[PDB]
Design a protein around this nucleic acid. Structure first.
Ligand code: FES
Ligand SMILES: [Zn+2]
Ligand SMILES: [Zn+2]
Ligand SMILES: [Zn+2]
Lengths: 19, 55, 61, 82, 96, 256, 91, 63, 62, 211, 107, 138, 98, 256
RNA sequence: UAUUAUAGUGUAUAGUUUUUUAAAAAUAUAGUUAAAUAAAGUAUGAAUUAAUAUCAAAAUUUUAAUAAAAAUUAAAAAAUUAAA
C-alpha cells in the first residue's frame, strides 16, 4: 500500500492533466 | 483453512480474555458538572469553560 | 521512493532535479531524459551561417 | 477594488468570456472531449424534487459556440477559392 | 557551576576559584557571556539593564537579582551572580 | 537505585567503567519464617521512603501493619537466625566493604519483541545408525521445548554473581561497582553478599570480617559534619599488574 | 540559490527552504537595478536550509558558480577598496 | 475454478471461463433487497446494476 | 433535567459529534465538507486561487 | 565528516589562552594557590526566612521584610542584608532533603512522636546575613533570637516587628541551616603534599593581596 | 547539464534586439514567444520570421545558413532545389526564448 | 511455554527516577573530578573547542621499560570543562608512524599535558589534512 | 465486569424453512387464523424499517463514512433497454389488473 | 572494559535511559527550536504516521502555520504533542526576536504574513509566561473517519493577545470564511488593520460565485468517487448570498 | 471509477487540486576487511479449505506400506501473537 498510494496519486494527477 | 470448526471450537475465543477485553467491556463514566453530559475521565469538550477547567 | 526525497530537509539540488515542470527555465536534463513525445524539447537551433563560416576560416588561416 | 477578471480583460482589450475560458478547463468552454462527472449531467424531476440540468447547476461551465467557432473551426469564406 | 542544584555551595565556589586558573586572560571587565550558566536570554537582559562586565554583575544587588530572575524571565541569574561575586576579587587582584 | 555511570582508575593504569548505585533510606521492614523451620529465616529490607498516596491500598496497609516508614520497594534476603536485625533498623552503605564480592540482582532493559537474529542470533542425536549394518532411526516429530525462537527479549530478573566492590561513599550513600549493567537508570537493584569464591569463603580472618549483623555507626560521628571527600573508601587493586602490559614474568623488560 | 533579474542580470543569493519548492526555478522580486517588480531566473544553487541526517552542514555544498560569485563580491581584491572604509570584522 | 453454485447469489469463488458473468456491482440477495440496495433505489431511482426494472406501482398507489 | 438532556442530545463519542456528521441547513454532511470550519480535514483547505486573484500571502498550498 | 569546517574559526584569527603556562610545575603551583585561596563569595546566613507566597508577590515587600527583620534583631537600620529570593519547586511528589523542597511545618526534632510531618509552610526562601565582621557566636545568637521571636509570634497568632512580619509580610517560616562544609580541605595539590608552612605562606599572600 | 550558469556573461536580452530576418525590434517584456539563441554572441528571430527568407518554409534539420544578413535553409544555401515539406511548411519547430538553445552555452 | 522471560514483580517494575532529585549526581561527579585533581592524575581545564583545537600536547605513557614519549596536536576534546567524563584526541606522528589516539583524563599512567597555552586552527586544519592523507594512503 | 455472551447455534446453522408443495399449507384448514407471531410470542408496538425513504437518512447516518457506494448517479449497464420484470412483480401486476 | 550490549540499539517504546558509555550519533542539532527529530524515544517528539520524514516535516509546517493563523487547531493522534511543542518553539523564536530567529521561522512556516504576525504579537503576549505557551486539551469526540483521538491545541494568554482577544471557540462561526465568534463582553474589540485586510481579501475569494461553482463541482466529484452523504449538486445551495452578505457585514461592523 | 496520458496535430508559469493510523517480529526498499516506510483498534469484508464426535501432551510396544489404528504406560489448562 505504501508505494501503491503514491502510484495512485500520480495516476490521478495524470488523469486530471489529460482530462 | 484445513477443517471445519464446531460451536465449542468457535466459543474458545469468548472463553479467552482478549475477546472480553475487546468486546465485553463496560465504560465507567459520570455526568459532567458543566455540560451535564455523559463523560469519561480524561476526555473533555471544546467549550471555553471545559478547556479552561477540565472536569 | 528515493532516499534524497525521503530526507527530512530536501536539498536544493534534489529540489531542482524534481523541478521538471514543462515551463520556461525548467531543467533541460530531465526533459531530455523524458520521452520525446512527453516533452517539447525540439532540435537545437544553430547558425550554420556566413559569419560563423568566416570566423572559422579566420581561425583556420 | 482588489482585482477582477472582467476588469483585467477590459484593461487589456480582451473578452471576459475568453479570459474565463482561458482560466477554466478547456472542456467546459470548448467542444472538446473530456471527462464529465455523472452528477453534472443532471436528472429529471422526481416526485419530491424538481428537474436538474447543467444549464441551471453550472451556467458558467457551459460551452460557447461563438468562441468555439472563432478559435477552433475555420470559416469557409476565409479559404473560399473560385 | 552550570549543574549547580538549588542553592550555590562552597564546593561550587571552590570549583570556580580553581577554574579561574584555567581562565587566565579573563579580566574584571570581561564580557558577561564568560560567566558560567549565562544564557543568551540572561546576557541580553543584563545588557538591557546596561550591565556589561563581570565587575558590574558582581556589583549588582539582591533586589536587582530578584527582578531579573522573576520579572525579566532570567533563569539561573542567582548562579551567574554568585559566579561573578566569587570570581571578582581574584580578577581584580590579577588586573592589579 | 542505579544512580549513574562513570570511569575510575586503579593504582595501576587499569580503567574500570564503574556503575554508581544510590542506596536510599534502607530499613529492615519485616522478619519472616515458615512456621519456624530451620533455614527459612528471611529479612525483608526497605529501599526508599515514599508518601502515603504513592502506593496501592494493600501496600500501604502492609507498611502500616509493619509499622516501618512506608518504603517504595521491599526486597527479601534469606539469612540465619544470628544475622537477624530488629525491624525498623537503619542500614548504612558501610554495611558492605570496599573490596568484597556482591551479587547484583536487577531488571534488564526492555528490548521488546525481537527476532532470532537479535535474541539467540548466530549469523543431541536421538537414534541413528553409525554403521550400515541395520536400519533404525527416530526422526523429530515436533518442536522440542528447548528451541531458540523469536520472542519478547528484554525485562528480566538478571543476577550478576560475585561482582567486586570498588568504592563506597557513605556520605552520599553510593556504592560503585566496576561493571556496566544492561539496565535502565532508576532500577531498584538488590545487593547481596557473595558467600564463597574459588572454593574459599568471602569472610575470613585472612581477608576480613563483616559488620555482623549490619553496620552501626558510632555516636560521636555526624555525617552532616563531614564533606563528601572525607567519606569515601577505595578498594585495593583488583588486578595484580598493568593489564596493558604483561606481568613481569611474561615481560621482556621491566622498569623498577 | 542565485537568482538573476530577467532583464538587468543583477544576481542575489538566497537559500530556498522546503516551504518554497515551487518558487526555485522562477521568482518575482523587486530588483534594485530596475525599480520595478521583475522576474528572477534561477542560475545556481547555494545551499539547502537545515542539513541532511548524520552529515555536516555543508555536505551538499554550494555550486562552483555560487562560490565564484561570492568570491568576486567578497574577495581580497573586492574587499580591499571597502575594507579600508570599515574593517569587515567590526565597525 | 468453480467452487459454489453458478448463480450470482452463490458464495464461493467462480472463474470467467467456466461461469462468465456480467458486471453486477450490487444486487439484492435471496432474502430480498437490503438497506444498501434500497438506499440506491431511493437515491438513484433504480438498483445500481441497472439491469433491474424499476417498479414502484405500490408506492404510486399508496401516495 | 439538564442531565437527561445531556444524555439524550449529548454529542456521543464516535458519533453524533462535530467529526461524525455536520448538519447543514437541512442536510447531513461529512465532517470534511463542513462549511463551519476549514480545518486540516476540510476540502475547503485544498482550494485556492480559483483564477481571480492569489488571495493569500502563503506560497506552498492553496 | 570532520566535526568542524575550515571556517569554524575565522581565517587568520587569534585564539585566547586557556591555561596559565605550559610549564606543569608553575601550572600546579598556581592551581595550589587558587585552591588554597579563601572563598570570596561565601556568606554564612544569619537566618533563612521563608514564606508560603510566591516570589512575584514577595518582591514588592522584600525591602519592608528587610527593615522589619532589622528592627526585630535590634540592629541599626540597614545593618542586615537579604540574599536572592529563591522559590522552591512546586514538586507534585514531595522529596524531603532537596534544597528546592518546600519546607514542612515541623521537624522530627520538634515532634519526635508524630507519624507524619505538618503540611508545607514555605514556598519561597530568602537568606538574612549580618555584617561579615560579626562573629559566629553573634550570628548564631541573632539567628536563635529571631527564630524564637517568630515562633512566639506564630503561636500567639494561633505592632512589634515579629507580629508585623507574621501578619503583613506573611512570612511563616524561619530556620538556621547548618554551615556549608562542602569546601575542600586541600591537603595535596597535583599529587604534592601541601606543607603547613606553604599553606600559611599562601594564606599570608592572599591576605596581603586582599588588604 | 541544466541551467547553464551565466555568471561570467549575464545573458540578458536588450530592449532593442532586432529580428535577424525582418529587422524589427523585439519587446521581451510583452511575451517570450520570440526565439533567442545566445551562441556565446546573440541571435534573435520572430517565430514567424524563422522560416527561410527565400522559400519561406520550415527547417527540416532545424538548422539555417545566414546569407546577406538573412537566414537561408541548408537546401537553399547549398543550391539544391527546395523540396516542399510535408509535415509542416511555415513554422520552424524551435522552442521560444532560448529553451531549445539552453542546452548549449558557457558554464 | 515451559519458561518465562519477563518479570512483573513490583521490586523490578519499580523505578526511582522520580526520587532521583534527592541525590545530586552532578555534584558527586564534580567531587570525583576534584579528587582526581588533588591526587594529581589530571589538572583542571576550562577550554572551548576553538581555543584548544590545534594545541600541541606532550604524552608520557609510563609503560615499561622505557616510557613512551609523544608529541601531537588536539583533534578534538569531548568536554569543555573539567570532568571525569572527558577525553582528548591526539595525532602523534613519529618517524614513519601516524597514530591518532584518544586519551582519557585521570589515568595515573597516561600523563598527557597540553604544552601550549593556545592553539592555532590553521595548524589543526593542516594536521587534519595530513592525517586524512595518511589514512587514505594506508 | 464483563457481559455474558454465547455464540448462537442459530447463526452457526440456519437452514431454510420448508417450502410449500403447490403453494399449499398442510394444516391451514386445521389451525386458527390467528397471527402466528402473536401465538408464538413476537409482538411489536412500533415496527420500523430502515429500507423506507423516511428512514433513508437515518440509515445513511448509521452507515460508516469509510464504506463507499460508487454508482450513486450513473450505472454500468444501460438502463434504457426493454427488459422484463421479476416473476412476483408480473404476478402482482396480473392480479391487480386481471 | 566494554558494556554487555554494544552499539546504539533500539529499545522498547517505553524504556528507561541508561548512562552506559556508547557513541551517540545525532542527525543534526536537535537543540534547534524548530528542527527537532521525531521518534518514540523519550528525547524525541512522537513521530505521527507519515509517508516519509519529508512528509512529516511538511505536515508539521502545515500544522504550525494553521496554529499561527488561528491559535486554536484540532489535530488527531500523535501529532498533537508535536504541534504543541512546535508552537512552544515558535513562541520561543518570537520572544528571542533575533533577525536570525525571524529568518529561521520564515524558512519553516509557509506564510510570511503569519511569521510577521507571530513575531509581532507573541513577544508581548508571552512576555510574562515562562515555559508553556500552548495547551493541549483532549476531546471526548473521536473522529468517525478512523476513530482517532482529537486534541484541541490552543495558545495561552488570549486576553493578552491583541488580534485574538475575546474569541470563543466553543463553536465555529456560521461560515469558515467569516470572522470567529466573539464573547458578548468582548464585542467591542478591534483587530489589527493588516490582519483584518488579509482576512477580508481571503474571504472575498469564497464570496465570489466561481467558488460556488467549484463547491457544486466538488459535490459532484465526491458523489462520483463514493462519499455517501453528498447531496446532489441540484439540491445543494450556495454558501454565500446577498442577504447573508449584508447581515454579516452589519455583524462585522457591530463587532469592529 | 484498475498497471495505466489512448497523444494525430500541437504548445510551454492556469496553485488544470480526494490517499487513514501513537511501538515491536518477519519481509521489501535503504576511522575493520575483500538510521527511513508498511500496527492494533473503529468500519467494511473476500478466497483456497472443510468426514469428524468438546478431541488427537508425551513415551513405550505392536499390528498388513506414514500408521494420532491398537495396547500399555503416562499425565495433556484457557485465550492471544509468532514460528513451517
Ligand atoms: S460539559 Fe461535559 S465534557 Fe464539557
Ligand atoms: Zn532588474
Ligand atoms: Zn521578424
Ligand atoms: Zn529555403
Amino acid at each position: 500500500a505504501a508505494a501503491a498510494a503514491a502510484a495512485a496519486a500520480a495516476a490521478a494527477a495524470a488523469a486530471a492533466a489529460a482530462a | 483453512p484445513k477443517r471445519k470448526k464446531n460451536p465449542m471450537q468457535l466459543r474458545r475465543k469468548v472463553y479467552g480474555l482478549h475477546f472480553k477485553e475487546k468486546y465485553l467491556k463496560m465504560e465507567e463514566w459520570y455526568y459532567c458538572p458543566l455540560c451535564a453530559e455523559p463523560k469519561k475521565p480524561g476526555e473533555w469538550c471544546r467549550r471555553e469553560d471545559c478547556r479552561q477547567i477540565k472536569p | 521512493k528515493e532516499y534524497r526525497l525521503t530526507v527530512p530537509y530536501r536539498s536544493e539540488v534534489t529540489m531542482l532535479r524534481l523541478a521538471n515542470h514543462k515551463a520556461i527555465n525548467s531543467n533541460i536534463r530531465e526533459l531530455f531524459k523524458k520521452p520525446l513525445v512527453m516533452n517539447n524539447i525540439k532540435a537545437i537551433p544553430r547558425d550554420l551561417g556566413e559569419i560563423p563560416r568566416d570566423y572559422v576560416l579566420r581561425l583556420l588561416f | 477594488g482588489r482585482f477582477n477578471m472582467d476588469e483585467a480583460a477590459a484593461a487589456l482589450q480582451l473578452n471576459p468570456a475568453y479570459a474565463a475560458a482561458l482560466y477554466r478547463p478547456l472542456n467546459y468552454t470548448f467542444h472538446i472531449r473530456g471527462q464529465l462527472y455523472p452528477a453534472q449531467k443532471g436528472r429529471p424531476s422526481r416526485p419530491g424534487s424538481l428537474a436538474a440540468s447543467q444549464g441551471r447547476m453550472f451556467p458558467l461551465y457551459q460551452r460557447n459556440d461563438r468562441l468555439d467557432k472563432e478559435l477552433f473551426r475555420l470559416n469557409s469564406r476565409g479559404l473560399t477559392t473560385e | 557551576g552550570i549543574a549547580t542544584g538549588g542553592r550555590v555551595t562552597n564546593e561550587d565556589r571552590r570549583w570556580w576559584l580553581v577554574h579561574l586558573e584555567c581562565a587566565p586572560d579573563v579580566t574584571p571587565g570581561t564580557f558577561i557571556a564568560w560567566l558560567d550558566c549565562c544564557g543568551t536570554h540572561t546576557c541580553k537582559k543584563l545588557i538591557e539593564r546596561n550591565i556589561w562586565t563581570i565587575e558590574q554583575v558582581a556589583a549588582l544587588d539582591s533586589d536587582q537579582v530578584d527582578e531579573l530572575k522573576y520579572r525579566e524571565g532570567c533563569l539561573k541569574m542567582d548562579v551567574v551572580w554568585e559566579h561573578a561575586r566569587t570570581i571578582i576579587t581574584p580578577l581584580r587582584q590579577r588586573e592589579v | 537505585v542505579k544512580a549513574f555511570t562513570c570511569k575510575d582508575y586503579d593504582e595501576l593504569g587499569n580503567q574500570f567503567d564503574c556503575t554508581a548505585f544510590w542506596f536510599p533510606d534502607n530499613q529492615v521492614v519485616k522478619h519472616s519464617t515458615r512456621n519456624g523451620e530451620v533455614g527459612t529465616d528471611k529479612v525483608y529490607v526497605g529501599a526508599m521512603n515514599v508518601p502515603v498516596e504513592f502506593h496501592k491500598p494493600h501496600v500501604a496497609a502492609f507498611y502500616k501493619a509493619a509499622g516501618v516508614p512506608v518504603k517504595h520497594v521491599c526486597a527479601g534476603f534469606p539469612i540465619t537466625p544470628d544475622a537477624y536485625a530488629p525491624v525498623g533498623t537503619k542500614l548504612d552503605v558501610r554495611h558492605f566493604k570496599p573490596g568484597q564480592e556482591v551479587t547484583i540482582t536487577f531488571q534488564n532493559t526492555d528490548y521488546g519483541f525481537r527476532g532470532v537474529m537479535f535474541r539467540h542470533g548466530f549469523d543431541g542425536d536421538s537414534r541413528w545408525q553409525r554403521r550400515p549394518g541395520a536400519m533404525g532411526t527416530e526422526g523429530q516429530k515436533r518442536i522440542y521445548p528447548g528451541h531458540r525462537m523469536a520472542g519478547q527479549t528484554g525485562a528480566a530478573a538478571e543476577t550478576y554473581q560475585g561482582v567486586p566492590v570498588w568504592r563506597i561513599d557513605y556520605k552520599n550513600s553510593l556504592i560503585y561497582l566496576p561493571t556496566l549493567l544492561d539496565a535502565d537508570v532508576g532500577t531498584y537493584v538488590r545487593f547481596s553478599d557473595t558467600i564463597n569464591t574459588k572454593g574459599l569463603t568471602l569472610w575470613n580472618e585472612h581477608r576480613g570480617l563483616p559488620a555482623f549483623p549490619t553496620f552501626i555507626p558510632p555516636e560521636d560521628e555526624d555525617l552532616s559534619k563531614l564533606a563528601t571527600d572525607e567519606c569515601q573508601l577505595k578498594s585495593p587493586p583488583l588486578y595484580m599488574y598493568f593489564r596493558d602490559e604483561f606481568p613481569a614474568t611474561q615481560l621482556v623488560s621491566q622498569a623498577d | 540559490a542565485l537568482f538573476s533579474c530577467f532583464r538587468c542580470g543583477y544576481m542575489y543569493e538566497f537559500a530556498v527552504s522546503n516551504s518554497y519548492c515551487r518558487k526555485l526555478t522562477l521568482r518575482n522580486d523587486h530588483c534594485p537595478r530596475c525599480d520595478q517588480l521583475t522576474l528572477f531566473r534561477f542560475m545556481s544553487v547555494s545551499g539547502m536550509v537545515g542539513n541532511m541526517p548524520f552529515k555536516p552542514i555543508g555536505v551538499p555544498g554550494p555550486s562552483y558558480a555560487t562560490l565564484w560569485w561570492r568570491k568576486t563580491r567578497e574577495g581580497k581584491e573586492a574587499s580591499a577598496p571597502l575594507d579600508a572604509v570599515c574593517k569587515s570584522d567590526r565597525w | 475454478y468453480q467452487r459454489g453454485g453458478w448463480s450470482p447469489g452463490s458464495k464461493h469463488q467462480k472463474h470467467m471461463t467456466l461461469n462468465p458473468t456480467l458486471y453486477l456491482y450490487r444486487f439484492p440477495g435471496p432474502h430480498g433487497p437490503g438497506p444498501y440496495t434500497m438506499k440506491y433505489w431511493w437515491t438513484l431511482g433504480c438498483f445500481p446494476t441497472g439491469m433491474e426494472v424499476p417498479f414502484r406501482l405500490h408506492e404510486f398507489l399508496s401516495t | 433535567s439538564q442531565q437527561s438532556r445531556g444524555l439524550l442530545s449529548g454529542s456521543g463519542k464516535g458519533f453524533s459529534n462535530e467529526f461524525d456528521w455536520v448538519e447543514f441547513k437541512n442536510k447531513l454532511y461529512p465532517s470534511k465538507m463542513d462549511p463551519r470550519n476549514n480545518e486540516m480535514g476540510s476540502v475547503f483547505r485544498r482550494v485556492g486561487d480559483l483564477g481571480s486573484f492569489i488571495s493569500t500571502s502563503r506560497s506552498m498550498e492553496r | 565528516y570532520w566535526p568542524y569546517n575550515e571556517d569554524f574559526v575565522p581565517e587568520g584569527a587569534e585564539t585566547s589562552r586557556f591555561q596559565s603556562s605550559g610549564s606543569p610545575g608553575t601550572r600546579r603551583r598556581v592551581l595550589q594557590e587558587y585552591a588554597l585561596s579563601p572563598l570570596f563569595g561565601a556568606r554564612v546566613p544569619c537566618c533563612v526566612v521563608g514564606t508560603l507566597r510566591t516570589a512575584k508577590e514577595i518582591i514588592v515587600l522584600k525591602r519592608d521584610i528587610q527593615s522589619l527583620l532589622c528592627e526585630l534583631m535590634e540592629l541599626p537600620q540597614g545593618s542586615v542584608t537579604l540574599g536572592p529570593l529563591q522559590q522552591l519547586r512546586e514538586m507534585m511528589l514531595y522529596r524531603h532533603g532537596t534544597p528546592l523542597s518546600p519546607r514542612l511545618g515541623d521537624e522530627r526534632q520538634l515532634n519526635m512522636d508524630a507519624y507524619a510531618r505538618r503540611p508545607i509552610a514555605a514556598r519561597t526562601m530568602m537568606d538574612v546575613f549580618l555584617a561579615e565582621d560579626m562573629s559566629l557566636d553573634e550570628i548564631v545568637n541573632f539567628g536563635r533570637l529571631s527564630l524564637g521571636k517568630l515562633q512566639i509570634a506564630l503561636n500567639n497568632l494561633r505592632v512589634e516587628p515579629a507580629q508585623l512580619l507574621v501578619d503583613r509580610m506573611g512570612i511563616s517560616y524561619c530556620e538556621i541551616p547548618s554551615l556549608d562544609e562542602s569546601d575542600y580541605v586541600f591537603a595535596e595539590v597535583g599529587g604534592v603534599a601541601v606543607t603547613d608552612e606553604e599553606a600559611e605562606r599562601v594564606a599570608q599572600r592572599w591576605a596581603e593581596r586582599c588588604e | 547539464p541544466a541551467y547553464n550558469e551565466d555568471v561570467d556573461r549575464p545573458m540578458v536580452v536588450p530592449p532593442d534586439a532586432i529580428c535577424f530576418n525582418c529587422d524589427k525590434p523585439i519587446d521581451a517584456g510583452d511575451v517570450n514567444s520570440y526565439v533567442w539563441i545566445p551562441a556565446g554572441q546573440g541571435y534573435f528571430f520572430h517565430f514567424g520570421c524563422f522560416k527561410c527568407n527565400r522559400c519561406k518554409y520550415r527547417l527540416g534539420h532545424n538548422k539555417f545558413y545566414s546569407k546577406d544578413g538573412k537566414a537561408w535553409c541548408i537546401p537553399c544555401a547549398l543550391g539544391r532545389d527546395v523540396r516542399v515539406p510535408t509535415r509542416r511548411w511555415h513554422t520552424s519547430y524551435v522552442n521560444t526564448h532560448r529553451t531549445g538553445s539552453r542546452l548549449t552555452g558557457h558554464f | 511455554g515451559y519458561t518465562r522471560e519477563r518479570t512483573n514483580r513490583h521490586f523490578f517494575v519499580a523505578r526511582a527516577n522520580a526520587f532521583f532529585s534527592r541525590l545530586p549526581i552532578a555534584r558527586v561527579q564534580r567531587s570525583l573530578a576534584m579528587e582526581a585533581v588533588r591526587e594529581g592524575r589530571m589538572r583542571p581545564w576550562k577550554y572551548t573547542k576553538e581555543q584548544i583545537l590545534g594545541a600541541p600536547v606532550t604524552c608520557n605513557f609510563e609503560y615499561n621499560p622505557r616510557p613512551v614519549r609523544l608529541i601531537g596536536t588536539v583533534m578534538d576534546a569531548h568536554t569543555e570543562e573539567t570532568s571525569i567524563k572527558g577525553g582528548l584526541k591526539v595525532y602523534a606522528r613519529n618517524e614513519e608512524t601516524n597514530m591518532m589516539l584518544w586519551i582519557p583524563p585521570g589515568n595515573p599512567k597516561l600523563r598527557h599535558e597540553v604544552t601550549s597555552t593556545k592553539g592555532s586552527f590553521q595548524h589543526y586544519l593542516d594536521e587534519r589534512d595530513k592525517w586524512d592523507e595518511a589514512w587514505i594512503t594506508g | 465486569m464483563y457481559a455474558r455472551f454465547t455464540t448462537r447455534s442459530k447463526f452457526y446453522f440456519r437452514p431454510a424453512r420448508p417450502a410449500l408443495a403447490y403453494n399449499v399449507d398442510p394444516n391451514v384448514m386445521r389451525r386458527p387464523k390467528v397471527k402466528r407471531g402473536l401465538l408464538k410470542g413476537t409482538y411489536s408496538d412500533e415496527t420500523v424499517d430502515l429500507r423506507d425513504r423516511e428512514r433513508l437518512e437515518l440509515l445513511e447516518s448509521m452507515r460508516h463514512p469509510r464504506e463507499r457506494d460508487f454508482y450513486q448517479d450513473h450505472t454500468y449497464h444501460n438502463q434504457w433497454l426493454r427488459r422484463d420484470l421479476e416473476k412476483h412483480q408480473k404476478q402482482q401486476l396480473a392480479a391487480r389488473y386481471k | 572494559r566494554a558494556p554487555p550490549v554494544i552499539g546504539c540499539t533500539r529499545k522498547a517504546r517505553w524504556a528507561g535511559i541508561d548512562d552506559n558509555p556508547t557513541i551517540t550519533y545525532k542527525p543534526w542539532d536537535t537543540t534547534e527550536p524548530l528542527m527537532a527529530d521525531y521518534g518514540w524515544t523519550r528525547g524525541k517528539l512522537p513521530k505521527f504516521r507519515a509517508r516519509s520524514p519529508f512528509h512529516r516535516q511538511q505536515i508539521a509546517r502545515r500544522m504550525v502555520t494553521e496554529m499561527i493563523r488561528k491559535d486554536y487547531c484540532i489535530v488527531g493522534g500523535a501529532r498533537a504533542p508535536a504541534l504543541r511543542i512546535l508552537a512552544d518553539h515558535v513562541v520561543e523564536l518570537a520572544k528571542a526576536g533575533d533577525t536570525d530567529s525571524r529568518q529561521q521561522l520564515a524558512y519553516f512556516l509557509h506564510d510570511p504574513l503569519m511569521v510577521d504576525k507571530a513575531f509581532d504579537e507573541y513577544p508581548r503576549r508571552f512576555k510574562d509566561m515562562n515555559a508553556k505557551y500552548a495547551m493541549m486539551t483532549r476531546l471526548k469526540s473521536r473522529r468517525r473517519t478512523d476513530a482517532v483521538a482529537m486534541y484541541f491545541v490552543e495558545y495561552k494568554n488570549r486576553d493578552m493577545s491583541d488580534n485574538h482577544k475575546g474569541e470563543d471557540y466553543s463553536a465555529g462561526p456560521e461560515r469558515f470564511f467569516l470572522p470567529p465568534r466573539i464573547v458578548e463582553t468582548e464585542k467591542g474589540i478591534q483587530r489589527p488593520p493588516h490582519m483584518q485586510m488579509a482576512f477580508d481579501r481571503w474571504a472575498s475569494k469564497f464570496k465570489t460565485e466561481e467558488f460556488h461553482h467549484w463547491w457544486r463541482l466538488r459535490h459532484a466529484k465526491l458523489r462520483y468517487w463514493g462519499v455517501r452523504n453528498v447531496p446532489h449538486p441540484s439540491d445543494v445551495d450556495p454558501l454565500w448570498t446577498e442577504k447573508e452578505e449584508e447581515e454579516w457585514h452589519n455583524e462585522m461592523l457591530a463587532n469592529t
